[PDB]
Design a protein around this ligand. Structure first.
Ligand SMILES: Nc1ncnc2c1ncn2[C@@H]1O[C@H](COP(=O)(O)OP(=O)(O)OP(=O)(O)O)[C@@H](O)[C@H]1O
Ligand SMILES: Nc1ncnc2c1ncn2[C@@H]1O[C@H](COP(=O)(O)OP(=O)(O)OP(=O)(O)O)[C@@H](O)[C@H]1O
Ligand SMILES: Nc1ncnc2c1ncn2[C@@H]1O[C@H](COP(=O)(O)OP(=O)(O)OP(=O)(O)O)[C@@H](O)[C@H]1O
Ligand SMILES: Nc1ncnc2c1ncn2[C@@H]1O[C@H](COP(=O)(O)OP(=O)(O)OP(=O)(O)O)[C@@H](O)[C@H]1O
Ligand SMILES: [Mg+2]
Ligand SMILES: [Mg+2]
Ligand SMILES: [Mg+2]
Ligand SMILES: [Mg+2]
Ligand SMILES: [Mg+2]
Ligand SMILES: [Mg+2]
Lengths: 492, 485
């Protein structure tokens, strides 16, 4: 063909993006990674989506796992391969060793296997093939060279057959060589590397497309998660900067604030409330979530610091009843510890919820909490995730950030996310006569006018009351002001 | 001969400057890298260019990839090789192994292949030769010493024949030995290393001319990109300090601002707009991007923080009308997340757009965003790149930076780009009576006078209104002045 290689869609969520269409038709993609990375799973999701979505027959060749075990473990994702096998759509060809015994199984092996495969393909009219762990085959007594040739033979005979194949391989080091023999990376046309990176005591899964001879692909590692739906990849670096923006306004749940914001937050906008511990971020959230129920809209509240019990105790105490918001089915509370998983897991958790509850407002009490430990880049990436997800989804996001130091805060955010956010509400402590009073400033607002006032405010059972600025002070921001004016009133 | 080693141009963008001229004639250059680095694409771009620019025949010896595949793959970049083959300008010598099977045909191995490569050179009057993955050949069962002889012999037969060769090898360690057997390094005259260095979930491609017997060449790694047009290297260090410089002015889209700058910006200049989050850089960017259209001059606005939609929104609330700008074909919006690529790539995309649109003004909203995560050195290199480019293309550039701390920032740029810039507009907050007012200062202008006052300003639908300075205050730069009555 006078054309540049074409790709078969895998349908594995996110992979097709990273691969600019899927896998090159007629060629073999090697998928390698250490133990428990998702090799096998990937190979099955590949054949499975083929059958279900394009009615393209597949042949799964297995060297170590038993056809029963393969079907069985597939139920973990709601896949009945047993049924597909029956309908002649899927054909697992068992090439594993019988628990008994026979020697010299390396000669005929490949050859007899190739026509076994050939016959299978020809037979069920298959378009997709998966060979799970070729590695275990020469794992009989071979050296690099014997591996290089044997491989080249199977890739080649397979290519001639016209099958779009996925071959699996095991590794021993997360970043060491690509595949056991350091010979496979070259013999294959395409190379994909699945990583199960430790780092901390957490494990981050990532997928990289090392090379796709003939075409272009995204470069690098992409975090992904195995779920009850298989491999789910998040091309955070593929998400486009083309989200929608309306001048539609919506309320903060605190009128005076709405005023300060030029008349309520924009519907399309990511909000951030910062400030030292205890200033009142959670309050503005509660009042923010509520406001979405009072108007009969749906809102979720992912809290990483407090519980569902405490969030309800303190919320009632500020006048709004979360209980009802629940029953009526307009408010949904999540709750979980930042350590209960890794950033890639949370982002998905979040994305999930959002799909089943279709919120109109979303609040994440404390990003500063999800930044506990994680790397700064890994974090920033996460923020783009949630942020960028809700933004294109016309969801108003309110995020919290506790400043690492009360009073004297020289930077809005310690993780520098400032640029990623549309609106920024600042809460700070002001020392005024041996007493600690709050201040509330609408630091910025992208589309609106807002008010440049550092208004003090109080919290009570009614909630937050926004009073007036400290016009007669110098160094408010510092948290430790000073009074001015030296002329009271005298005669002429 | 009696003179300076002659060099054959590769025409591979940027490589000839790196190698000062091209690849040494009649000698063979070793090119190694790990899988997916572009070894093949290099050796094919070598022959392919020889044929298309110089009508120099080429012979492509393949040891693993199939001839039809090598052809097919090249379509990636829009290169019909089947044709070049059919016209006799290129010949793909298929030396790979039989898919079927045999083991006693290659007993005259090395020698026979030399007579085949040799017969082909004389046949097609080949000048350039690419041997792809010689490595896999001895990948049958050999020891280092055995590889140093066969390699030597070959290289020699081609040097005798007089062909200028490109032999490609494969590595396993991005920074370990140059080739599998740590023997090819020294059997070749030239060594070029291709690297796909990971480093933080992102890959960066670099090229390095490790050695070139007999001549000089640029030392160290240069970053490259494999695009639709093949390899493409930016010799960022090879860019000289030879940009033209006029005294002609241009407006900032804000009269008063042009007044503070002694009559606006200099056409040939890099302007920096620093300020804490919210101060108003984008408001300035927009007004700058608009002034180019009113003058019927093209301008590109590379956004990395907001969107085409939002920008358009916010632009509208400040007056103007980005919509019209677009239609009229006077303004172009880009948009992309820093993460949506590595610095090397972004640089390109930018370069790219500029070429297809020939803008008079460029605005990169938030350099500070581009600097996210990357290394400071790799970032400086990026600024020197974009900057230097516009500076040589007579393009006026407005770059934006957001300081990490609002108020009291003690340096214009955290990444330290100040020196690389001609003019620096600075925006800061100032606490006046429990309120947050703005201030704008033309911190520096290399060829003009410019006002030295720290004037306050408001943002209204109409736009930015530069007013008067805080004369009766002390420590305004501290963010929290001290009104002295
Ligand atoms: N329903 C599920 N939800 C979440 N994770 C799961 C689920 N099922 C399996 N997993 C995870 O995926 C893993 C299975 O790995 P998998 O069988 O895909 O291939 P592998 O380890 O790459 O290769 P191989 O097991 O053949 O050596 C489990 O170990 C577990 O970590
Ligand atoms: N009924 C109430 N009356 C007066 N003040 C209250 C009442 N409830 C809470 N507060 C005040 O509000 C503060 C609680 O903080 P809040 O729930 O707003 O979250 P935060 O400051 O954002 O984050 P964190 O509490 O984790 O520091 C307390 O410090 C307290 O002074
Ligand atoms: N049109 C294209 N646009 C962008 N990138 C491309 C395009 N075509 C190929 N690529 C990229 O270039 C690479 C090609 O590498 P190439 O086949 O030239 O040799 P190699 O990777 O050095 O060695 P090997 O033969 O072992 O793969 C691909 O892996 C891919 O990342
Ligand atoms: N319609 C408007 N009317 C009055 N003021 C506005 C209006 N729109 C925006 N503003 C003001 O302008 C500021 C917006 O900043 P701008 O869009 O210019 O970029 P920035 O501050 O430089 O950077 P970033 O917003 O990415 O942090 C807000 O802080 C706000 O005070
Ligand atoms: Mg707290
Ligand atoms: Mg709290
Ligand atoms: Mg390679
Ligand atoms: Mg190659
Ligand atoms: Mg900013
Ligand atoms: Mg901005």
């Amino acid at each position: 063909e006078h054309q540049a290689i074409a790709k078969m869609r895998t349908m594995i969520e996110g992979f097709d993006d990273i691969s600019h269409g899927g896998l090159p038709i007629g060629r073999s993609t090697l998928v390698s990674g250490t133990s428990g990375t998702g090799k096998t799973l990937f190979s099955i999701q590949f054949l499975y989506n083929g059958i279900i979505e394009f009615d393209e027959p597949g042949v799964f060749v297995t060297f170590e796992e038993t056809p029963q075990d393969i079907i069985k473990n597939a139920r973990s994702f709601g896949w009945d391969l047993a049924k597909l096998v029956d309908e002649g759509k899927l054909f697992i060809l068992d090439a594993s060793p019988d628990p008994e015994g026979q020697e010299v199984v390396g000669g005929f092996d490949l050859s007899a296997l190739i026509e076994r495969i050939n016959y299978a393909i020809q037979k069920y009219r298959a378009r997709r093939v998966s060979i799970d762990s070729v590695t275990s085959v020469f794992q009989q007594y071979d050296a690099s060279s014997v591996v290089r040739r044997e491989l080249f033979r199977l890739v080649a005979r397979l290519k001639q057959i016209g099958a779009t194949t996925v071959m699996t391989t095991e590794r021993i080091e997360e970043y060491g060589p690509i595949a056991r023999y350091g010979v496979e990376e070259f013999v294959s046309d395409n190379v994909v590397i699945l990583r199960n990176v430790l780092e901390g005591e957490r494990r981050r899964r990532t997928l990289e497309i090392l090379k796709l001879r003939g075409t272009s692909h995204m470069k690098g590692e992409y975090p992904f998660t195995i779920t009850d739906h298989g491999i789910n990849i998040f091309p955070l670096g593929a998400m486009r900067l083309t989200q929608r923006s309306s001048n539609v306004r919506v309320s903060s749940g605190v009128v005076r604030l709405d005023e300060m914001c030029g008349g309520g937050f924009f519907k399309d906008s990511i909000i951030l409330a910062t400030g030292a511990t205890g200033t009142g971020k959670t309050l503005l959230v509660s009042r923010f979530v509520e406001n979405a129920c009072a108007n009969k809209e749906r809102a979720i509240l992912f809290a990483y610091e407090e519980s569902r019990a405490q969030l309800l105790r303190n919320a009632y105490s500020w006048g709004m009843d979360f209980e009802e918001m629940e029953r009526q089915n307009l408010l949904k509370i999540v709750c979980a510890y930042p350590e209960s998983a890794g950033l890639e897991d949370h982002l998905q958790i979040i994305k999930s919820e959002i799909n089943d509850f279709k919120p109109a407002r979303i609040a994440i009490d404390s990003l500063s909490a999800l930044a506990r430990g994680v790397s700064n880049n890994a974090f920033r990436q996460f923020v783009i995730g949630v942020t960028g997800y809700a933004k294109q989804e016309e969801i108003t996001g309110l995020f919290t950030n506790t400043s690492d130091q009360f009073m004297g805060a020289h930077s809005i955010t310690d993780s520098h996310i400032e640029e990623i956010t549309d609106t920024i509400i600042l809460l700070q402590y002001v020392e005024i006569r041996g007493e600690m009073s709050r201040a509330i400033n609408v630091f910025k607002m992208r589309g609106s006018w807002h008010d440049k006032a550092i208004r003090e405010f109080m919290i009570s059972d009614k909630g937050p009351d926004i009073k007036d600025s400290f016009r007669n002070f110098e160094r408010i921001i510092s948290g430790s002001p000073t009074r001015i004016t030296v002329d009271e009133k005298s005669e002429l």
